[PDB]
Structure 1
Amino acid sequence: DEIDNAKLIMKERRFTASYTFAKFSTGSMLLTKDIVGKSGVSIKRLPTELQRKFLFDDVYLDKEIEKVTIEARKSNPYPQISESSLLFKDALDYMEKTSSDYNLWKLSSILFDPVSYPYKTDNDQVKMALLKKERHCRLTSWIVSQIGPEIEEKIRNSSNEIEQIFLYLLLNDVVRASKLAIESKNGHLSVLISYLGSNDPRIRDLAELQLQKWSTGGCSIDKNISKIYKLLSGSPFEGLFSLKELESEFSWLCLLNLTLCYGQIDEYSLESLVQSHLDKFSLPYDDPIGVIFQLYAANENTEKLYKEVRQRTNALDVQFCWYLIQTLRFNGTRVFSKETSDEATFAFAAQLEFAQLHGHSLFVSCFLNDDKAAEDTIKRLVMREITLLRASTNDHILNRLKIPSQLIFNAQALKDRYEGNYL
């Protein structure tokens, strides 16, 4: 007598017994129906796939805040970042030296973090040339450590000393590469190896001019003695006796180190140099250290590549992308569009919201250019999570972020008011 309406209405309403439902809520939690709730409301929560431990400790957020200068925007009292001395470097301490992150980070910190003389000499032709180089070593010196196990061990495997030498070069270790040369009664090399580090055309030509001759009825020559002269010619990969063959067992990075050490084909910019390597060789798929290079390599096209890149790979961590754009934007380092920046600031500031770490969210939120949006978010974020942003999160985050005196009092008053009746 009561089931016919449930049937009538269930039916007069196109309602299958399959009817389910789910709705996200203010805190960002969704309410699925499961039968697991006193009233069947599975209030599951939203996963912050943002995996990086240090984000959960006051210290980082707290300390990284002193790294900035906040100032109310031009169209309202809502704070926005004026100046930020933020470098990839900063992050290194909170990570561990064995993770790929430390690398990705340590790398960027090298490719983008500013270089600097530690004494005031001003021949701009000089200072500009030093930093030019400081950045050079810094990077090769790194790859030397990344290919250390790789090559070092690949050396235990050789009966051939000449091949052994070519290997020591591959690690940019001339001193030991030379010692070996003399000790094996293969001295003439110790000489070239001497020149290798410099840029002398005499040699260069002496090398190449010889190479050409070596292709005419003159065999029984080590592939190693040849490969080595090749390292003198200048461009080794685009050569008359190319090394492009090495792609077989050498880490692409092993090769790159070559083009950066002996491949100074022309005396120009590094960024463009790196870029030269990328042209002859295909890169490792899904690789973060890889991508980061393309970004460095594609100088002015920076933002364009980024867009291009993010559209194909999940290798670059939201938080990274953000920290990138930001460290690059506040150092003049590259060319980044307001639309694209804020575009990725939301991204991050969002993950930080699902995690509930509002302190971080609000802070990243200041990296918003659109004064309307900034205000828009901030008012929202704070109005809902005031209690959480109060008494112990360090006791003042909000005053620290130059947030509006009124907003605080307003949203505050509102909850006290809310709790007021609940009691």
Structure 2
Amino acid sequence: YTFAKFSTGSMLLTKDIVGKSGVSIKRLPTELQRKFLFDDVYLDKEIEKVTIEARKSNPYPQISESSLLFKDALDYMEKTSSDYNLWKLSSILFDPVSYPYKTDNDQVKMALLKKERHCRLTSWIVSQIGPEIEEKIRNSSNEIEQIFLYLLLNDVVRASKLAIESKNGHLSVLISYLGSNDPRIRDLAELQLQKWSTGGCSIDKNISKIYKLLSGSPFEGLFSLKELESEFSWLCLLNLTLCYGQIDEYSLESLVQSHLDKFSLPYDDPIGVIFQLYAANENTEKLYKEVRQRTNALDVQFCWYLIQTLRFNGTRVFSKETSDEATFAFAAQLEFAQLHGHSLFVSCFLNDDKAAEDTIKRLVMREITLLRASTNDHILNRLKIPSQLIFNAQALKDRYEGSEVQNLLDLAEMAIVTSLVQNNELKTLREILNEFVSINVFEVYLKLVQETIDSLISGMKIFYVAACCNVMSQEIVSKILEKNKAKLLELPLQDLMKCTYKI
């Protein structure tokens, strides 16, 4: 026999005859594997990037402005880790570029922004493929092949130089065109290729490759580099499409898409996934959903961050429901990590007001104690946690540990019971007046000081146990003090012993 249920603080107790209690306090294994999340500084600086506004259907906080960028996380990761690569590439493709220099008109601006982005993407790809190709150049035994490989590293100049040196001068000149998108050169190169591929008794295997690069359509083609699929990282070939490929005529997106249309990427590879989401443009969400059911390369946190960035930057569009789905999932992972402040922060990116309300409330009340320690916990409860919720939760924590100002801001009767000094009573009376049970009020008014009515009220309250008896005894004492004939008898009509002594 075994037993196990989930805790309030979502964790698990099981039969365990090895402890002291006969159960085990198990810290639920958190899927959330990303170091900087457990450090509260990250969370503080992350809240600094947000503008919280109360809802239009309730007072609960939800995010109005976010300036979060894939860029921002990079400081908290190793520049060597694959994770860093994911976040970086994601920054390059999705975070807005700024172009500081003023531009004659705005379509120009747009064009510059495209060139900039393109240049960074292609410099980065070259960063990645770098060693692969350098290895390949190490092992080549043929100069023209080396020239080609230098083109694989998007180094037009060293290709040109080696050409020059290996006495391949004309080629060298031709090479200098790579990366200007001169359509003349494009159609000429392609022409030369058809003429060869119709007779052309023999053309060197790598010169044809280089001409194919000048053609602007290196796989899309009839002398196709597609077979290099088996000799190079998919990223390496994509570099070829992006650098040569037809830069001007295409948007970065539809260009990348063009390439992807020619080659299936491995399902599991995440830098692949990011390119696909980038290229998918018109239906990122569609693809994102597809990506979800196929692989786990994108983690809960990343998927949430992505969706949120794209949402708050106009970059892309996601369903309220998909954004909320992502948000739920991550908030939950966080709560499983006892990261309540952080889960709380994430919970605010919910679109559904009802759900936000519930989630937030439930968590704050269940976990108020921990959420009231440092200033990094203060800014937390100064997200826009409703005054009501915070004190209410705090009221609950008091009833359970065995407050009054919060109550002032049934239960009230029980509080009066616990209280059973004059100044405190007066303050309570003032609070009650401000708010404006009736029996208690009459009694208080009498104490501060019709009398029969107050008496009947107090008796009724007593009937409605220890506190009531105390109040009755107090009233008796007060009456005795006042006395110190028929009216007195009417008012009168251990306690029993006292009554007997009185009679």
Q: TM-score, normalised by structure 2?
A: 0.78
User: What does the per-residue CA deviation read over 1:185-220, in whole Å, with 9 as the maximum and x for residues that have no partner?
Assistant: 111012111122212233222212111121344344
Q: Report the Cα distance in structure 2 between the residues aligned to 1:330 and 1:375, rounded to whole angstroms.
A: 21
| 2:340–2:371 Cα contact (<8 Å) kept | yes
Q: Report the Cα distance in structure 2 between the residues aligned to 1:370 and 1:395, rounded to whole angstroms.
A: 25
TM-superposed deviation, 1:403: 0.9
SS in 2 for 1:332: coil
Cα distance change of structure 1 residues 196 and 73 upon mapping to structure 2, 3 Å threshold:
same
TM-superposed deviation, 1:120: 2.5
SS in 1 for 2:6: coil
Q: Report the Cα distance in structure 2 between the residues aligned to 1:368 and 1:160, rounded to whole angstroms.
A: 60
Give the match for residue 130 of structure 1. 112
| 1:104–1:288 Cα contact (<8 Å) kept | yes
SS in 2 for 1:380: helix
Q: Report the Cα distance in structure 1 between the residues aligned to 2:152 and 2:114, rounded to whole angstroms.
A: 22
Alignment partner of 1:353 is 2:342: no
Q: Report the Cα distance in structure 2 between the residues aligned to 1:139 and 1:66, rounded to whole angstroms.
A: 29
Cα distance change of structure 1 residues 73 and 122 upon mapping to structure 2, 3 Å threshold:
farther
| 1:300–1:335 Cα contact (<8 Å) kept | no
TM-superposed deviation, 1:419: 1.7
Match of 1:155 among 130, 137, 153: 137
Q: Report the Cα distance in structure 1 between the residues aligned to 2:28 and 2:85, rounded to whole angstroms.
A: 30
Cα distance change of structure 1 residues 266 and 127 upon mapping to structure 2, 3 Å threshold:
closer
Mark the structure with the bigger radius of gyration. Answer: 2
| 1:365–1:378 Cα contact (<8 Å) kept | yes
| 1:162–1:224 Cα contact (<8 Å) kept | yes
Give the match for residue 80 of structure 1. 62
Q: Report the Cα distance in structure 2 between the residues aligned to 1:122 and 1:306, rounded to whole angstroms.
A: 38
TM-superposed deviation, 1:122: 4.3
Question: Which contiguous aligned blocks of 4+ residues in structure 1 show a shift greater than 4 angstroms?
Answer: none
User: Share of identical aligned residues, percent?
Assistant: 100
| 2:371–2:381 Cα contact (<8 Å) kept | no
Considering fraction of residues, name the structure with more helix: 2
- Where relative contact order (Cα < 8 A, 6+ residues apart) is larger, the structure is 1
- Structure 2 counterparts to residues 4-83 of structure 1, below 5 A: 19-83=1-65
User: What does the per-residue CA deviation read over 1:276-331, in whole Å, with 9 as the maximum and x for residues that have no partner?
Assistant: 11111111231111111111111121111111111111111100000000000000
SS in 2 for 1:417: helix
How many pairs are equivalent? 404
TM-superposed deviation, 1:21: 2.3
Q: Report the Cα distance in structure 2 between the residues aligned to 1:414 and 1:105, rounded to whole angstroms.
A: 43
TM-superposed deviation, 1:36: 2.4
| 1:143–1:253 Cα contact (<8 Å) kept | yes
| 1:295–1:305 Cα contact (<8 Å) kept | yes
Q: Which moved more, 1:337-346 or 1:397-406?
A: 397-406
Q: Report the Cα distance in structure 1 between the residues aligned to 2:45 and 2:21, rounded to whole angstroms.
A: 45
Match of 2:97 among 104, 115, 131: 115
Cα distance change of structure 1 residues 131 and 212 upon mapping to structure 2, 3 Å threshold:
same
User: Which residues of structure 2 form unaligned runs of 5+?
Assistant: 403-501
Q: Report the Cα distance in structure 1 between the residues aligned to 2:74 and 2:291, rounded to whole angstroms.
A: 24
Q: TM-score, normalised by structure 1?
A: 0.92
TM-superposed deviation, 1:335: 1.1
User: What does the per-residue CA deviation read over 1:23-73, in whole Å, with 9 as the maximum and x for residues that have no partner?
Assistant: 112111122113224342233231111111000111100011110101111
Match of 2:373 among 374, 378, 391: 391
Give the match for residue 139 of structure 1. 121
| 1:359–1:397 Cα contact (<8 Å) kept | no
Give the match for residue 198 of structure 2. 216
Match of 2:152 among 164, 170, 176: 170
Q: Report the Cα distance in structure 2 between the residues aligned to 1:31 and 1:293, rounded to whole angstroms.
A: 44
| 2:13–2:26 Cα contact (<8 Å) kept | yes
Alignment partner of 1:268 is 2:261: no
Cα distance change of structure 1 residues 266 and 114 upon mapping to structure 2, 3 Å threshold:
closer
User: What does the per-residue CA deviation read over 1:94-150, in whole Å, with 9 as the maximum and x for residues that have no partner?
Assistant: 000111110000000011000111123241221010111111111011000001111
TM-superposed deviation, 1:266: 7.2
Q: Report the Cα distance in structure 2 between the residues aligned to 1:153 and 1:229, rounded to whole angstroms.
A: 24
TM-superposed deviation, 1:240: 1.6
Q: Report the Cα distance in structure 2 between the residues aligned to 1:388 and 1:399, rounded to whole angstroms.
A: 11
| 2:11–2:27 Cα contact (<8 Å) kept | yes
Q: Report the Cα distance in structure 2 between the residues aligned to 1:238 and 1:391, rounded to whole angstroms.
A: 62
Alignment partner of 1:95 is 2:77: yes
| 2:341–2:377 Cα contact (<8 Å) kept | no
TM-superposed deviation, 1:174: 0.7
TM-superposed deviation, 1:176: 1.0
User: What does the per-residue CA deviation read over 1:146-199, in whole Å, with 9 as the maximum and x for residues that have no partner?
Assistant: 011110121011221111101111111011111111111111012111122212
Superposed CA RMSD: 3.3
Q: Report the Cα distance in structure 2 between the residues aligned to 1:122 and 1:317, rounded to whole angstroms.
A: 43
Q: Which moved more, 1:194-203 or 1:288-297?
A: 194-203
Cα distance change of structure 1 residues 130 and 265 upon mapping to structure 2, 3 Å threshold:
closer
SS in 1 for 2:52: strand
Give the match for residue 412 of structure 1. 394
| 1:275–1:298 Cα contact (<8 Å) kept | yes
Cα distance change of structure 1 residues 193 and 272 upon mapping to structure 2, 3 Å threshold:
same
SS in 1 for 2:76: coil
Give the match for residue 291 of structure 2. 309
